[model samples]
Target: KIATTVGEARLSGINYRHPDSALVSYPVAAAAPLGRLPAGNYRIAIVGGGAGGIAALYELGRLAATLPAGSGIDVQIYEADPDSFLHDRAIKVRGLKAGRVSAALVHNGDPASGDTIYEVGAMRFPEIAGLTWHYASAAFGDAAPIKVFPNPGKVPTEFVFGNRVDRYVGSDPKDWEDPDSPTLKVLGVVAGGLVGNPQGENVAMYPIANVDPAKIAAILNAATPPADALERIQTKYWPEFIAQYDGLTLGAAVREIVTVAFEKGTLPPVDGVLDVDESISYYVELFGRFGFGTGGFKPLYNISLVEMMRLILWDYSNEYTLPVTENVEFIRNLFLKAQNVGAGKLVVQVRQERVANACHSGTASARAQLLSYDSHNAVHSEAYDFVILAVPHDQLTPIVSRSGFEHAASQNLGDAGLGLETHTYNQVYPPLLLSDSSPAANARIVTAIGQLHMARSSKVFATVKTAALDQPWVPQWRGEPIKAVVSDSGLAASYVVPSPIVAPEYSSLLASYTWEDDSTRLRHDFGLYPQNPATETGTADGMYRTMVNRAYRYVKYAGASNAQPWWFYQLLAEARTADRFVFDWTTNKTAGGFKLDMTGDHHQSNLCFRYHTHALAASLDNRFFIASDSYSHLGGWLEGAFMSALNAVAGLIVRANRGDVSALSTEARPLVIGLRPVVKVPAA
Candidate 1:
């Protein structure tokens, strides 16, 4: 008989249907229908206290408040790094002391630098980043004010390539040879590939050997639609473009288009797929250098063509723009404040803690096995009801075996087909894991699988004296403060922080935030090979010195016609020698090299794409849930992390309520609106 049990299940327990029963089959017999906690307290453990984990805490606080007065939930956040900015300021959460580092370290070692926020992680957000926007609205509302500045994407900026400096205010396709120049190559290539001669053969093609610069430029500049171009692309240009090209990788699409262009006669098809390095060059030249935002060309051609198109569509549809602030942590702390008020707890410096195993003590009760080691090297074990793996794939996969399910998981007990195959678990134990589920009653096995695509990035922050800011040509930069510099010497980009005052203690940002080749270069330059310290010796110092020298050169190069170069260098000298902070996340074990590096053959497979999204976010056995930007399509963005956390929470609530999603009271509807759907796929 199909059973329907609701609310009576433990407020925090999970119940599974019979193994032979299909998911479509109604509520088949469930083990004890799970158990209800009645009127009492429940526990939730959040692994990885990054943005995603914190978002979960804030969302849960709001959701838990809807319950009866006496009933409440306790949330705990575990973090390995002790350098998060939230520890010292106490900006919002009064009693929450999560981690520690130095404020000077955070702001270029210059206490006098006003509100100069240095971030090794996500520092900017687009206005259309749904989750962040929603969170800001729900938390601050219209009353309390949060300063939101327009990013410098459209601001007049200087591009430096081959020691030559050029200036522009917007996306104008000029100076095609410069790596950092915002040019029309990509747009031109796409447009050229789309048009064909009457003979049905493509004609608007550029031969790599003797391409006409002006000809292609004109096509791209004009063919490219305005900000809301996606709507026009759909209605006016080609509605089926996405449908036709969704399956192609960026490299594959580029090659296909290039092959057609080549056929129209100019050059022969180059060997190998469109070079990944060349793809990154185009992306950085067109997008990154201009602060078109979202950092650099992360994993470029490694992703699908449709993925790239989606970002373009989002921008075209929503007018891609960012609401900047002095520090993103300030907003993050706001969530922490709400969490603290609800008595949530945060533990820092709990490095190397692993989940030994998790199982149920009774029909309605679930327990997560946790093994933690301290600075003293002693190990401790504890248990929690719900385990949220908010960490990335690298961190997520390692603990699965130690979780007491190694034998069963290794046995491939519940292999799902298609993108949901068991091979992932056998290889890396998909993001989520299940214990005591129907098909795998006594065996702790894989329920849903997910993978991550990591991107490597780094930030170099320095403080400068304000006296150097008095340049005669400053006004020519469209009245924008702080000169923005995009370079080609592996320096990536550097710019002055927009500050209210022009004092002697201002901060400047130099970031090589990227993926693939860029990251590989940075890693080698910074001597980030942790396996060998001798090779990387003095690398950090060298990197900082190089940054200072390049900025000096750039300032001189930029002001050659207007002002003295030494004067600019003097300002930079003061900042570098006295108040500079250099952090190479690549080699820093604590920072974990700035997200996952999603490059190489392993990441280019169709399976990898499926793994990173669907598999990464899939819930396991109705108990363990995974949350991370790695589990999202918009990987490496704050929105990805935000969405994952919300999705995980929704699943947890549904399982706790015995599959009755209404368990989340109507008052909690707003919080659960974007969460994962209630119906779950059966284990493979």
Candidate 2:
């Protein structure tokens, strides 16, 4: 179970590709080029080291290596976590399961189903017309290294739909079997051919108005289809006759398909198994609309349908009702991994209360985790040219909403509320405690294990245990014997702490990106009440309410409970004040609503990385041009960060090459032109 945001990887929650992944670090020697100085190049600081930040660093390093012979740039990465840097690389999730089980039953070669709409050619030639042919990379040829609809933003459903006329094809849908409907009349005429025509009179050139839109539009614009085909299908009882063959009903069918999928425990491989385009061809021929692609809607592919269904199911989980436990982990890991990618350097700061009750319902700690400690802290602030903030929109809005943070320049950004979306996650192995007589004596223990239904082998819970032992302590694991007993006096168990967001990768999302759109956030009465944006939902349209609901519902409805894994053991515990204990013990279990809490410097989302780095660029405008994955809308990605930094540094290099001494003094401006207004229907 891996939790991820839309663009993060097209999946979310409890990422466990690496069984040993529990956020640990190791040490090693620093990079060879100890440090160097360059003309007009002073210390460049980057705050985060997740995907975006790391990308920024990679580019900055390349810049240093490329400057004229001896030219160097004084770049220091101020990543708080140094151990991770020594052993870290971009986090990657692999080994996706082939298909969902329920897929085969409901979707067996049925062209009428939406799932089969794009699979007309199975896997061959599967791609939306404009999307595949137009939205592609010039540099990468057919490989299409870049996708048109990038992640971190909403997808255009209408545009990707197979036919723009699908919804309105029939006249006010009375019923699927309504004889008065235009769809069935048209379908019957085409399938029945000329021999079935009640009146056989062929003008041989005029087309019927009810034919395919491509041909109809063409005729309206001057072109025409053969009159014979049209006359044959225009029967007196055409309306009732058309009802004989069952017609397409994608929306209703998709719902049943998804439910079937849930029960079977897998997603069917829709990649190479349908032919929507060809199947609909006969309809065109019978209707006398022979010309294909002369106009109207273009061809659609199978992959589009696959991705669409995935998104639809995701939306349903977030919109209709509370989600299952797995989704909570999804949200948590999305933030964590994204943050990890954004910062490259990772740190987790939390109040004692939040950690202890991370998985359970607990009041917000007096102070949310805001600070972090990492070795690269200095370098992150000094070395990189840009940074990214990959966290949820709800978490970030408040930060920018602060008095000192919000300024006249950012007046239009509006309120970014505390994220309240509860994601379904797990905390099976509660952190165990170590005792003098325990296997890992004198060490504190913390751990839990659970499984996500989606993937048979994915772990839904995670643990970060500490012990009183020597220097280094890894999670205790044994082949098959009992390491310790739960009831034993020597191994007396301590209280279990569950977090609202427990999955590892979802937590990583916090490192790379955050929400940027106003539509995705909502203002809830989480104490600030009136302070939240004024919308219909909260006197402010409840604009972001849906997002908040999505986050909360997923986890709350998953039959949430705390349980320890069979392999659970003891680790060391650190003694501290009550506050400190809470911080150390808090897990995702305690999380309920968006309590204005934040994950301290982990993987962030694309938005998060971009927001942080771009802000930094805007803040340090003159002295530093922004360079990071976030700047390029490539949050938590090495390529994004690298390219962003390159662009920033490239501008400087261009100025330097021109001998424009004023270049160093010039400032970098934000790329987003201005706040653009959009239209939406006012809900009743």
Which candidate achieves the best lDDT against the true structure?
Answer: 1
Candidate 2 local lDDT, 1-684, one digit each (tens): 212222222111111110011110000001121122245433343433333334334434534553454344443333322222212221111111000000010112332231111000001111211111111111112332222211111110001011111111112233222333223344333222211222344311112333322232222122123444333332221222223211312222233333333234332222235243333332232122211111111111111221222222112112110111111122223224323332322223211111001111112311111222232221100112222222112222232222121111212111223222222212111111112123221111111000000000100111222122112321221211111111111111122221122222111101001111111121121122311221211221132222222322111111337333211222212211111100100111111111110111111221222221222122122222334322332222222333344344433343233322232212221111111101011100
lDDT of 1 by residue, 479-533 (tens): 5444555555565655565443234355554333444565556565553342211
TM-score, one value per model: 0.63, 0.25
Among all windows of 10 consecutive residues in model 1, the one with the lowest summed lDDT is 17-26
- Who wins the TM-score comparison? 1
Q: Report how far residue 44 has shifted in candidate 1, in Å.
A: 1.7
* Angstrom error at residue 176, model 1: 13
